[PDB]
C-alpha cells in the first residue's frame, strides 16, 4: 500500500499566481462587461468557479467569444466581489453589499456562495 | 477594522475543476511534447507552477505557440508526474522515479519540488 505526498500551499499558491497574471493582464482571454464596466479574466478560472461560465464556454458557438456581456441589471460591484473571490477564496460580504452579491451569485450559478449569503442574511 | 470570510476548500476546488477540464480536453490551449509523447494542458496553470513556462509564455514570440517541445533527454514520466502535481498538489515521488522527477523539476524551474526531492534523497 502506497501513501502520498501533498503540498499544503500548492492550490492557494496557484490561485495567487493566477491572480497576479490577472492583475498584469497576462494570458487573459475574455472581457466580461456589466453596465459599461469591463473586467478582464481567464476563461478557465471562470469555468472552474461558475456554473454560468462553465455552460457558456462549453457551448461550441460561445466558446470563442472574447467579450461576454452580462445582464445590465446586475450590480458590477457584486460581480467584482465574486471575481475577486474566484481568484482569492476570500468573499467580501458586507451589510451594504450582501443582497447584490447574492443576486449576482445566483445569476452566475455559484451555489456555495449563494448558501453562504443565505446563512448571513438569516443570522442578521 | 474589518475581518474577512475565507472558503476553506475554494483553491483546491478550483484546481480539481481545472484538472477535470484537462481530463476532458476543455479549453486546453497547449500541447507539451517530450520524446514523441504529448501532454495537453492549460498555459495559465503551467505558468502558475513553473518558472520555465512562465518565462516562455511571457516572451512575445513564444506566447502564441500551440506546441512546445522540451529537451528530449527529459523523462516523460517525470514530466507527467510534475504535470499531475501542478493540477492536484500531490507529488508521486517513489524510489524508482525520484531522480527523474528531480531532474525534470530543475529543468522546469519548480524550486519547491526540487527542495522536496533533495529532502527525500538526503533522508535515504
Amino acid at each position: 500500500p502506497d501513501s502520498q505526498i501533498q503540498f499544503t500551499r500548492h492550490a492557494s499558491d496557484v490561485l495567487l499566481n493566477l491572480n497576479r497574471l490577472r492583475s498584469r493582464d497576462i494570458l487573459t482571454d475574455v472581457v466580461i462587461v456589466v453596465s459599461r464596466e469591463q473586467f478582464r479574466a481567464h476563461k478557465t478560472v471562470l469555468m472552474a468557479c461558475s456554473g454560468l461560465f462553465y455552460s457558456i464556454f462549453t457551448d461550441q458557438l460561445k466558446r470563442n467569444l472574447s467579450v461576454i456581456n452580462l445582464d445590465p441589471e446586475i450590480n458590477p460591484e457584486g460581480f467584482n466581489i465574486l471575481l475577486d473571490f474566484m481568484y482569492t477564496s476570500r468573499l467580501n460580504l458586507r451589510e451594504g453589499n450582501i443582497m447584490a452579491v447574492m443576486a449576482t451569485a445566483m445569476y452566475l450559478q455559484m451555489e456555495h456562495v449563494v448558501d453562504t449569503c443565505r446563512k448571513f442574511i438569516k443570522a442578521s | 477594522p474589518d475581518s474577512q470570510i475565507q472558503f476553506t476548500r475554494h483553491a483546491s476546488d478550483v484546481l480539481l475543476n481545472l484538472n477535470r477540464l484537462r481530463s476532458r480536453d476543455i479549453l486546453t490551449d497547449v500541447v507539451i511534447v517530450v520524446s514523441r509523447e504529448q501532454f495537453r494542458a492549460h498555459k495559465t496553470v503551467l505558468m502558475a507552477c513553473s518558472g520555465l513556462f512562465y518565462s516562455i509564455f511571457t516572451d512575445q514570440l513564444k506566447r502564441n505557440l500551440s506546441v512546445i517541445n522540451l529537451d528530449p533527454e527529459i523523462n516523460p514520466e517525470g514530466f507527467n508526474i510534475l504535470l499531475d502535481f501542478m493540477y492536484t498538489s500531490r507529488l508521486n515521488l517513489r524510489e524508482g522515479n525520484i531522480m527523474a522527477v528531480m531532474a525534470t523539476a530543475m529543468y522546469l524551474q519548480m524550486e519547491h519540488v526540487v527542495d522536496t526531492c533533495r529532502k527525500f534523497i538526503k533522508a535515504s
Binding site: 500500500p1 502506497d2 501513501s3 502520498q4 505526498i5 501533498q6 503540498f7 499544503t8 500551499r9 | 519547491h112 522536496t116
Partner: peptide, 8 residues
C-alpha cells in the same frame, strides 16, 4: 511544514 503525508 509545506508538506504532509496522507493516504494513497
Amino acid at each position: 511544514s509545506d508538506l504532509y503525508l496522507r493516504p494513497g
